[PDB]
């Protein structure tokens, strides 16, 4: 088999994370998770997980990739072969994430194609998909729903009144999802990655458009009330466990933690490459992107609350369609709104596409690290690219149906951004800190970076990330409140069971692999554990 390649440049690693873990989890997910959990009170567990767990486990995952020169799963066969199920857990998480993430890009593409005509369809109440309750935004103050909300709910989503009624497959979103999957297949199976083009247009224009949205949102009237909602916290909201777990999994979501993606991108690093300053600068880039886009979108929501004469927490969707309400509403107040809509949904497509390329690459890299000499370079590996893309498309068709928004919120809360992320992050930190050793891994890091990680990273992998993950997990279990879509829908018991099935299929890769390896090896159980804890 051919040897595993390294990056062609120092900036090829940096541009693969900066498009990889700086994506829709910043401009789309952090806004509605902040919105749904009260705005101000979301930021305290956000920053607690960001410093205690986010950047530490992000650098930990990249530096695990750099040490082992392996991606996702087989990186754990040189650290602790007993806990190799962290890799399979990461692969399950990244597969479910690939499915619903590409569904987000399908919604963005449908908004992009619906932006091509000269009048934006979410701007006025004259269309077939609206209701008699439709009042224009300016006419609200002079049970009324805005045109952006009914556009999102009744043209894009075509929202059935339950998950029990899937309705019919929306061929608009189905063809949009197929187009984005053909784009993802053409950027992996060709292996282009736009190496001569991602230096400027990919790297800057999403952030330039985010700055444009910042300037637009701060100039809307009533943006100060929205920023007050965004920043000023409710301490009584922190007593509820959803704020803590939602912020922690948003941190573990934005950073591509528990996915194998950052191990895979770190696996292409050179051995004697200082990843620490790159990891810190790019983590600051990711968290700053989320926090800046939060300022923009919550200034827009404060304007929307001012214009419609309703409270800030009730003006838009407390669910996964906030970036498709507030941001299009802000687009409808830019000069020449059609062109700015085209640029915005090209922004969301660029961010989500760069992410989806990077985590599809991480999933493929993990699954070819499992089997060398089978998916070598082509004529068998290229078929498996199309197989992964086709199965993830067919699983993504369940979020295209008229009740597929509920399936999306199920996947988003449970499949790849919930207790599964806390589970795998706790197991990564526990393995590295105690079964490998903070001092042994620090010796490895000094051997290859140049210096040992400080008392921040060492004590974060040792104590802080395990206590945060264990506390948030048991705090969500002992004060359990079930999943609700847009604060009004109550999910049925089979839907909560399906979400827990996705989460546990992410979780149960670790105990299944532990039991499988403790059953395969011969000897007494203490000898079996002591053999499987030794790295290979």
């Amino acid at each position, epitope marked *: 088999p051919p040897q595993r390649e390294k990056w062609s440049s120092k900036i090829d690693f940096v541009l693969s994370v900066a498009g990889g873990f700086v994506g829709l989890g910043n401009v789309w997910r952090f806004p509605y998770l902040c919105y749904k959990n009260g705005g101000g009170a979301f930021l305290i567990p956000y920053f607690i997980f960001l410093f205690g767990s986010g950047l530490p486990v992000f650098f930990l995952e990249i530096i695990i990739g750099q040490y082992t020169s392996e991606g996702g799963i087989t990186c754990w066969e040189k650290i602790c072969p007993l806990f190799s199920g962290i890799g399979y857990a990461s692969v399950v998480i990244v597969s479910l994430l690939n499915v619903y993430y590409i569904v987000i890009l399908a919604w963005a593409t449908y908004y992009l194609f619906q932006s091509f005509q000269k009048e934006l369809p979410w701007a006025h109440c004259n269309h077939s998909w609206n209701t008699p309750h439709c009042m224009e935004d300016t006419m609200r103050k002079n049970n009324f729903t805005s045109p952006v909300i009914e556009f999102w709910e009744r043209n894009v989503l075509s929202l059935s009144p339950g998950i029990d009624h899937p309705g019919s497959l929306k061929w608009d979103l189905a063809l949009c999802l197929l187009l984005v999957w053909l784009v993802c297949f053409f950027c992996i199976w060709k292996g282009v990655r736009s190496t001569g083009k991602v230096v400027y247009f990919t790297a800057t224009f999403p952030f330039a458009m985010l700055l444009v949205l910042l300037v637009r949102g701060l100039t809307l009237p009533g943006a100060g009330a929205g920023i007050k909602f965004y920043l000023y916290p409710d301490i009584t909201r922190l007593e509820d466990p959803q704020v803590w777990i939602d912020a922690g999994t948003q941190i573990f979501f934005s950073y591509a933690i528990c996915l194998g993606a950052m191990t895979s991108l770190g696996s292409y690093n050179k051995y004697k490459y200082n990843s620490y300053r790159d990891c810190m600068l790019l983590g600051c880039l990711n968290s700053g992107t989320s926090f800046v886009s939060g300022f923009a979108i919550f200034s827009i929501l404060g304007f929307m609350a001012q214009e419609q004469g309703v409270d800030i927490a009730d003006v838009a969707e407390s669910g996964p369609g906030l970036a498709f309400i507030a941001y299009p509403k802000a687009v409808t107040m830019m000069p020449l709104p059609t062109f700015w809509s085209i640029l915005f949904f090209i922004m969301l497509l660029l961010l989500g596409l760069d992410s989806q390329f990077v985590e599809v690459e991480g999933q493929i890299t993990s699954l070819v690290d499992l089997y060398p000499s089978f998916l070598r370079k082509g004529y068998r590996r290229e078929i498996f690219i199309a197989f992964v893309c086709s199965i993830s498309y067919l699983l993504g068709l369940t979020m295209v149906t008229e009740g597929g928004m509920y399936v999306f919120q199920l996947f988003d809360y449970y499949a790849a951004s919930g207790v599964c992320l806390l589970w795998v992050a706790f197991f990564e930190c526990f393995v590295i800190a105690w079964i490998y050793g903070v001092n042994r891994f620090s010796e490895d890091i000094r051997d290859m970076i140049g210096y*040992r990680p400080g008392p921040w990273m060492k004590y974060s992998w040792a104590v802080i990330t395990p206590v945060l993950c264990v506390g948030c997990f048991i705090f969500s279990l002992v004060k359990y409140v079930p999943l609700t879509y847009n604060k009004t829908y109550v999910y049925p018991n089979w839907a909560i069971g399906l979400g827990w099935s996705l989460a546990l299929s992410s979780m149960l890769c670790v105990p299944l692999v532990i039991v499988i390896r403790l059953c395969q090896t011969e000897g007494p159980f203490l000898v079996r554990v002591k053999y499987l804890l030794t790295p290979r």
Partner: antibody
Amino acid sequence: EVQLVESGGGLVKPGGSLKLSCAASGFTFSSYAMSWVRQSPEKRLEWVAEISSGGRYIYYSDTVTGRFTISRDNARNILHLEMSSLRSEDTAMYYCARGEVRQRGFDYWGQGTTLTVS
Amino acid sequence: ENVLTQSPAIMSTSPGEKVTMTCRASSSVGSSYLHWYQQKSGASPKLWIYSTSNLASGVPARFSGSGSGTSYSLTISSVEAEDAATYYCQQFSGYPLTFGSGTKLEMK
């Protein structure tokens, strides 16, 4: 007060052996990689051998690449250097240098041990 | 090996005069890995400038370092009588670590 005290300085025959002993004090010896750096009578410094924090990464220069052995004793906070097949062009003045951060270098050195081969 | 060809050892300058000494590397040092050591007469070397720009503890502000990649330089703004020593550059990047040759600074 970080203090490195080297021991084992003396004359050996050609083809002989010697075992130096950098006895460190005032700091946690387990958390810093240690390097042996020798100084020729022409005052040309040459790095000899580096051992990592826990002793799993061991590096040698090409002049001692197959006949020098460097070890630690983290319980006693002492560093070693085992020599074999000591030739004539190995007479030097041996320092142990606390080189742990590669971007900070050999920040703390110690005393010396004159190794003489004749 | 990464042979660090340094400035010639025999240099003699008056006190209070700005001096410099260069350090040419055969390979490319990463400019955060090349350090400078001051060894006095009959004493052990000590770290003087690390990562070719920063000043170690106990090093006066009159010392400075510059350069990157191949050429690296140590510069004294005003040489005193206590600056009479031998200075070695040292890349601390490649696993066969190499010190530079001597550059002996003596008075007049």
